[PDB]
DNA sequence: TTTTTTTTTTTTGAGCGACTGCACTACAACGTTGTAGTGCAGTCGCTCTTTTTTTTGCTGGTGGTTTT
């Protein structure tokens, strides 16, 4: 799409394909049936009754 | 294009340095012999650490799992 004319080696395309195969995004699906195990972002202000916070040691969070 | 069998483990330390025994000549004590010093070879102890250091995009943004 940029109309590149010069030669492109193998390692650049190999690293670009390796970067696009490990781009699996963190799932934010919520199921109302079972208890939801998830990270902080998906529900920021949703008002649940019981709220548990794991992994609150130094270095990891924030 | 088809198809057969099968239950037995092995090996691994070597260089450095001392202990002890026998041979071998030099030299003084009593021509010959006993004591002393060294060379070479078989046998044997011993001994060979300690450790840790990191950036990676939570959903960076037309994004988003699941039913007929």
From Swiss-Prot:
Say which domain of life the source belongs to.
Bacteria
Cleavable signal peptide: none
Gene inactivation phenotype reads: Decreased degradation of DNA with free ends that is unable to undergo homologous recombination, which can fortuitously lead to more efficient viral infection. Cells are deficient in DNA recombination repair and have increased sensitivity to UV light. The cultures have many inviable cells. Cells can be transformed with retron Ec48-containing plasmids.
Disulfide-bonded cysteines: none
Q: How does it assemble?
A: Heterotrimer of RecB, RecC and RecD. All subunits contribute to DNA-binding. Interacts with YgbT (Cas1).
Tell me what else is known. In the RecBCD complex, RecB has a slow 3'-5' helicase, an exonuclease activity and loads RecA onto ssDNA, RecD has a fast 5'-3' helicase activity while RecC stimulates the ATPase and processivity of the RecB helicase and contributes to recognition of the Chi site.
Which family would the database say this protein is a member of? Belongs to the RecC family.
Entry note about domains: The holoenzyme may undergo conformational shifts upon DNA binding: the nuclease domain of RecB may swing away from the DNA exit tunnel in RecC. When Chi DNA binds to the RecC tunnel, the nuclease domain may then swing back to its original position (that seen in crystal structures), allowing it to nick the DNA 3' of the Chi site and then rotate to load RecA. At high Mg(2+) the nuclease domain may swing back more frequently, explaining differences seen in assays performed at high Mg(2+).
What task does this protein carry out? Answer: A helicase/nuclease that prepares dsDNA breaks (DSB) for recombinational DNA repair. Binds to DSBs and unwinds DNA via a rapid (>1 kb/second) and highly processive (>30 kb) ATP-dependent bidirectional helicase. Unwinds dsDNA until it encounters a Chi (crossover hotspot instigator, 5'-GCTGGTGG-3') sequence from the 3' direction. Cuts ssDNA a few nucleotides 3' to Chi site, by nicking one strand or switching the strand degraded (depending on the reaction conditions). The properties and activities of the enzyme are changed at Chi.
What is the protein name stated in its UniProt record?
Answer: RecBCD enzyme subunit RecC
Q: Which organism is it from?
A: Escherichia coli (strain K12)
**Originating gene:** recC
